[PDB]
Design a protein around this ligand. Structure first.
Ligand SMILES: CC(C)c1cccc(-c2c(C(=O)O)c(C(C)C)nc3ccc(Cl)cc23)c1
Length: 131
């Protein structure tokens, strides 16, 4: 989607440590990930969407087709089954592993990209602005 393409820099984050804890991330990884301010680079070619995330902590990349489940290795090394759909202009990403699920919604709001991460009762909100 047009709205998403770009290079995005994290400018604010709320509740991310709690989110990571709920997901099961160990303390040492939480410490470094929680202080990261990544750049997110979203691009599209035809049916394939690529989301690259870059930081001094680590880099990740996913490439996917909407509605096609794929295997993903997360930044914390979970091996998850991911499915990403476009729902009312929002990219909705569900990760499933070990009977658990987390949902990551990526939305365009004014000139920002807002990421809402939910695991059980924890909701984290991360805001990015154009680089
Ligand atoms: C790879 C580098 C750039 C990085 C730095 C900081 C946080 C993440 C991260 C993200 C993310 O913002 O890309 C996410 C999103 C899917 C919500 N989920 C995560 C879950 C567990 C852990 Cl430990 C880290 C992350 C990734």
């Amino acid at each position: 989607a047009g709205a998403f393409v770009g290079t995005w820099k994290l400018v604010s984050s709320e509740n991310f440590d709690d989110y990571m804890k709920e997901v099961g991330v160990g303390f040492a990884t939480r410490k470094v990930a929680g202080m990261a301010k990544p750049n997110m680079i979203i691009s599209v070619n035809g049916d394939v969407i690529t989301i690259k995330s870059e930081s001094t902590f680590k880099n990740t990349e996913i490439s996917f087709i909407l509605g096609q489940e794929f295997d993903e290795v997360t930044a914390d090394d979970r091996k998850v089954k991911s499915t990403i759909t476009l729902d009312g202009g929002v990219l909705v990403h569900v990760q499933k592993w070990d009977g658990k699920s987390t949902t990551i919604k990526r939305k365009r709001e004014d000139d920002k990209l807002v990421v809402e991460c939910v695991m059980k009762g924890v909701t984290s909100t991360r805001v990015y602005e154009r680089a």
